[PDB]
Amino acid sequence: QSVQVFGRKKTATAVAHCKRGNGLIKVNGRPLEMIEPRTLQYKLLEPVLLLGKERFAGVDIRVRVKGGGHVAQIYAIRQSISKALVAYYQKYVDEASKKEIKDILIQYDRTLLVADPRRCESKKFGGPGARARYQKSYR
Amino acid sequence: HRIRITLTSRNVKSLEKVCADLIRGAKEKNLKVKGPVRMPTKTLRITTRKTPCGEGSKTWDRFQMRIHKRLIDLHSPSEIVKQITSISIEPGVEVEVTIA
Amino acid sequence: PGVTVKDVNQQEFVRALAAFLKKSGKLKVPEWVDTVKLAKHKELAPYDENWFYTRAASTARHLYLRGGAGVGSMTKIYGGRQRNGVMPSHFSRGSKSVARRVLQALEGLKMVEKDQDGGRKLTPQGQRDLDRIAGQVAAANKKH
Amino acid sequence: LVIPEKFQHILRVLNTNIDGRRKIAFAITAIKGVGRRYAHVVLRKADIDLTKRAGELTEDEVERVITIMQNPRQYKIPDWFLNRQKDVKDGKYSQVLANGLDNKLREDLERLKKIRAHRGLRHFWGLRVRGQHTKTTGRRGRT
Amino acid sequence: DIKLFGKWSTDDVQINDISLQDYIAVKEKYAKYLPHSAGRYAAKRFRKAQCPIVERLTNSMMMHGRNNGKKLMTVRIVKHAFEIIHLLTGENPLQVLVNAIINSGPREDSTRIGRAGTVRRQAVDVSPLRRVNQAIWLLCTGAREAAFRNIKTIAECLADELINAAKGSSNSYAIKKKDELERVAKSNR
Amino acid sequence: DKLNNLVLFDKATYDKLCKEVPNYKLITPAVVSERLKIRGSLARAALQELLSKGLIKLVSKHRAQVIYTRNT
Amino acid sequence: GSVELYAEKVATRGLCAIAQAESLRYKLLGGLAVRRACYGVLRFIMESGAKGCEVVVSGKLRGQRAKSMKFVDGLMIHSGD
Amino acid sequence: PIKLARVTKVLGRTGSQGQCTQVRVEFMDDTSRSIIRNVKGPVREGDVLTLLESEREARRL
Amino acid sequence: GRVRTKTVKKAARVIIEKYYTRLGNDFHTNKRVCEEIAIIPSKKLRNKIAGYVTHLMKRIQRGPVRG
RNA sequence: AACGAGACUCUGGCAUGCUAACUAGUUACGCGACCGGUCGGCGUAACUUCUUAGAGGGACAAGUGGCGUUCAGCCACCCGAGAUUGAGCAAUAACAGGUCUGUGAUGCCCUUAGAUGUCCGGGGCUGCACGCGCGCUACACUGACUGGCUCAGCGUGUCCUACGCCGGCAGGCGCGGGUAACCCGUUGAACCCCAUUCGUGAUGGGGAUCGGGGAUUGCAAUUAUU
């Protein structure tokens, strides 16, 4: 049937739902081609270009994205799709193609399956930010 | 008919003990309950200059208080409602009851 | 099969919907369009002489996307940055008279009906008119 | 990509010179009293294209520009758009221009110098007017 | 295969120096689609050497205070700078970039040794990693100085900087500053 | 010194545009501007009618940068 | 009639800091020497089962110049939660 | 001419502020000869240096 | 730097000299035998004792230790 | 042996394992709109992936390979969410360090009825030849202008405000919600991004300065409140 898997950059959280389909990839009910920042278009295209159009042929993935910024949200989609296809296999096909896809993805990029744990450090008094301090006056 | 019990405290240990006691008592009698739902914690922040005279190196105290909330829902008459609450009494816990 | 406005581009669709409204003549244009700015955080008047048609198209698209708005809610949409001299820049808002008389010169089209628990929404005919133009934009994309 | 036949490098509008290679929506802004929002609304009401260089204008077009410019009221220009709206001495809504704009500032200062207002004495002494902090800034001109 | 921006291949690029061959990451596992990976190469030592050289070029161009986070503008600057060189030279812009990196790095330098006052500098060697880093620095510095107040768009002054360096020409900021730098170090032999 | 650029085409500059430019391999508003000593707007406007006539091929188009080449 | 006040006894008086910081105040206010007033408080604190005690007295004890006398006994922690 | 030498081991850090590194380098041609050199920048074993003047041997900085 | 302290080293030495029979080479089992016996506060302090125990049991196979 | 260091508390990163949800949602199914698709259009049932917050786990230089008087430890690597996250607290002994202008903390000295108490009216604290420190805006094309498209988190609220009408706007009138995961608010933020115009120039960069109007807060805006 279906699986629901999330991807997560700084504060953005994309959730991809996959079921039996015919090759539809859509984020927010919108085509993957026209996600607003076209400069980072290939990051969204990396999983399907690496694996191939024939693996997303019996699967229908719909993504809902919320939080964070534009660049973080784009990075939260390429991870969500990759994780959801890995989760769709090893549950509906076998434990043999999940390994193949997981390897192919993780040699190219580890952030396609593992989330970056970095988050903003809190501001500290006595400076504009976490580390920067105010200019010190002598005489 | 619907009975909403709202619990609010600052000590989560005491508040959770009270909530567990209330839920267990309602299970003990023949009642149907809606489980404890936790509202987001309320964090109140006061930041103050440490010095009383504005002389030193401009250090600041960061003060804060935390308020914990729960909600429980029952379907029972008020006669049945007003036994378990009277059994369990704990300081710092603000129990409130609303009939629909 | 068919399309919606979500299946096509938006910067080209607004340019194409704004031309469908300009060729019917039912849209009623205020007397002050040649003089007024669109917000208080803008230094010049809009470059396009037909800004009212483009803004009407953009408001129609926003109403299609999210159902229900108002004059101030449709003024938050077209807000931006105001550069305050030697003081830091700040978020600023648009003009409510424009936000309200683009939302009124769309009831003369029978294309926007007042929302029940709020402001404005889209009519079935208004949904039709946007889908039938998304169709032409998609055809232009496919055949080229 | 155009090669107009008649094209003047420097034209004369309202006792001041204007570059013909400059663009019309910003060329007339050169003459005093006109900014970047009054110079555009005058051109819209005169129905003159803004894409042309100032040189690419016939005699009638330039003569019309001054006509709508100097009489904004007759061509449905709102009253809040001028540079002296409710005048002190006669109370008329008029747009003053290059030779008149500076002929109605000296009168404004002479009013407050003859009638010894505080701000007219500030303008007289050369100090500042809008209630500023003169302790630190403004040390140019002063020796 | 996986080619930069979808149209510039990598398998045809050859690194000349054996010295900088392992400090330039262009060919097999570094063949990416974009100079954008959200990498963490600045966590341990010598990790930056695994960063793709095109992405290394991209970062150093978002310099001076007004550009410190505008990476998407630099991705299109590099994208347009690669499609211009190929129109002039007709070669692979990746090969042109590699040849510029090789040419514009100093191979000998000078280090302060005398006590404060009179300058008694010596002559020392240069690490391959520092040579790559400083080639990138010089190439990016010459691109933005030549474009600061010109009609010439950037990504056209970067292309001209990269062309003149892959030829080892004296019409190049990086070559000019590399020659002046090894000149002084020879004087201090 | 000052950089005085022609705002409008005369005979010599127009002929040099029509003949010399279409073989540059690097038709570009920033290039044609220094070649013909004309303003960045006149060259920019003149490079679209060359495309309309079919004499040059468009390579790249964007806000910050537009890039043309020769025919064939 | 809503509010009612009740009075009760502290279980152990020697381990309450306030009851000892007020007991020592009524000995310095009644003519005891400071050195003997402070040892009489430390002794009662330790004999009641405390693990450690510290008593500090500050002010003009000798003339027009102030100074501090500190009396410690046992263990005393200073840092952490 | 230009020689190429391969770093075999890192000895220590020299310079007024520790900005240079002692290395012993082995030549590619006539590999039997190994000499002491000073470098500038991050160096690890296996790095190959390009020596322009290949006669000097290093000393403390 | 990752250097233990006299508290953890003393506690681990005592545990080893008192319960040699049950302790072994596995960390995750020594982590569970320490919680059963010694009254230790939180996991971070529990683990640093049960890690030095596992480290210090390997040395015993090499021969005796002076502690 | 003890204090200090460490430990400790709060916080960030992980759990498709547990306990839960109409003041959070998702999936499915109906009704509906439009051309199988889209719907933050409307209503039911599957539950907790997403949201919220409680419990318990989880990381210890633990495993491997080197170095180390083979100890204490250091370097690299695999696996792994993570192989140093950031703060709070903080010793003995001192300083003629700041605070009598925070206090019904306080000793002396001064004054106390044409007052050094207290209230009322109007001024000053900001004045300006000149020096000395924190800063905010810039010196532009890696830009400005004009349109279009598209994303947060921490907080406040019985002053925060949705909706409708007149206004270019600043701003005004009538009904509504919220003592709040219930309403502003699915917080449609700005840089970012996509098209246009400008074209190296004290220029459409940059905004100081100053003149006319208009509107708000207040008893009062004149030494311009905003």
Curated annotation (Swiss-Prot), chain B:
GO terms for molecular function: MDM2/MDM4 family protein binding; RNA binding; structural constituent of ribosome; ubiquitin ligase inhibitor activity. It is found in: Cytoplasm. The keyword Transit peptide does not apply. GO terms for cellular component: cytoplasm; cytosol; cytosolic ribosome; cytosolic small ribosomal subunit; extracellular exosome; membrane; nucleoplasm; synapse. Keywords: Acetylation, Cytoplasm, Isopeptide bond, Phosphoprotein, Ribonucleoprotein, Ribosomal protein, Ubl conjugation. The modification Phosphoserine is found at S76. GO terms for biological process: cytoplasmic translation; positive regulation of signal transduction by p53 class mediator; translation. It comes from the Eukaryota. The keyword Nucleotide-binding does not apply. Polyubiquitinated by ZNF598 via 'Lys-63'-linked ubiquitin chains when a ribosome has stalled, initiating the ribosome quality control (RQC) pathway to degrade the potentially detrimental aberrant nascent polypeptide. Deubiquitinated by OTUD3 and USP21, antagonizing ZNF598 activity. The modification N6-acetyllysine is found at K17, K58. Component of the 40S small ribosomal subunit. Component of the small ribosomal subunit. The ribosome is a large ribonucleoprotein complex responsible for the synthesis of proteins in the cell. Belongs to the universal ribosomal protein uS10 family. This is Small ribosomal subunit protein uS10. It comes from Homo sapiens. The chain holds residues 18 to 117 of 119 of the full protein.
Swiss-Prot record, chain E:
Keywords: Acetylation, Cytoplasm, Isopeptide bond, Nucleus, Phosphoprotein, Ribonucleoprotein, Ribosomal protein, Ubl conjugation. The gene is RPS5. Disulfide bonds: none annotated. The keyword Ribonucleoprotein applies. CDD domains: uS7_Eukaryote. Belongs to the universal ribosomal protein uS7 family. Component of the small ribosomal subunit. The ribosome is a large ribonucleoprotein complex responsible for the synthesis of proteins in the cell. Part of the small subunit (SSU) processome, first precursor of the small eukaryotic ribosomal subunit. During the assembly of the SSU processome in the nucleolus, many ribosome biogenesis factors, an RNA chaperone and ribosomal proteins associate with the nascent pre-rRNA and work in concert to generate RNA folding, modifications, rearrangements and cleavage as well as targeted degradation of pre-ribosomal RNA by the RNA exosome. One of its GO terms (biological process) is regulation of translational fidelity. Its main location: cytoplasm. This is Small ribosomal subunit protein uS7.
UniProtKB/Swiss-Prot annotation, chain F:
One of its GO terms (molecular function) is RNA binding. This is Small ribosomal subunit protein eS25. It is found in: Cytoplasm. Component of the small ribosomal subunit. The ribosome is a large ribonucleoprotein complex responsible for the synthesis of proteins in the cell. One of its GO terms (biological process) is ribosomal small subunit biogenesis. The modification N6-acetyllysine is found at K2, K11, K19, K25, K53. Its main location: cytoplasm. Disulfide bonds: none annotated. It comes from the Eukaryota. The lineage of its organism: Eukaryota, Metazoa, Chordata, Craniata, Vertebrata. Keywords: Acetylation, Cytoplasm, Ribonucleoprotein, Ribosomal protein. Component of the small ribosomal subunit. The gene is RPS25. The modification N6-succinyllysine is found at K11, K53. Belongs to the eukaryotic ribosomal protein eS25 family. One of its GO terms (cellular component) is ribosome.
UniProtKB/Swiss-Prot annotation, chain H:
Its main location: cytoplasm. The keyword Signal does not apply. The modification Phosphoserine is found at S34. It is found in: Cytoplasm, Cytosol; Cytoplasm; Rough endoplasmic reticulum; Nucleus, Nucleolus. The keyword Ribosomal protein applies. GO terms for molecular function: RNA binding; structural constituent of ribosome. GO terms for biological process: cytoplasmic translation; maturation of SSU-rRNA; ribosomal small subunit assembly; ribosomal small subunit biogenesis; ribosome biogenesis; rRNA processing; translation. CDD domains: S1_S28E. InterPro entries: NA-bd_OB-fold (IPR012340), Ribosomal_eS28 (IPR000289), Ribosomal_eS28_CS (IPR028626). It is linked to Diamond-Blackfan anemia 15, with mandibulofacial dysostosis: A form of Diamond-Blackfan anemia, a congenital non-regenerative hypoplastic anemia that usually presents early in infancy. Diamond-Blackfan anemia is characterized by a moderate to severe macrocytic anemia, erythroblastopenia, and an increased risk of malignancy. 30 to 40% of Diamond-Blackfan anemia patients present with short stature and congenital anomalies, the most frequent being craniofacial (Pierre-Robin syndrome and cleft palate), thumb and urogenital anomalies. Belongs to the eukaryotic ribosomal protein eS28 family. PANTHER family: 40S RIBOSOMAL PROTEIN S28 (PTHR10769), SMALL RIBOSOMAL SUBUNIT PROTEIN ES28 (PTHR10769:SF3). This is Small ribosomal subunit protein eS28. It comes from Homo sapiens (Human). The lineage of its organism: Eukaryota, Metazoa, Chordata, Craniata, Vertebrata.
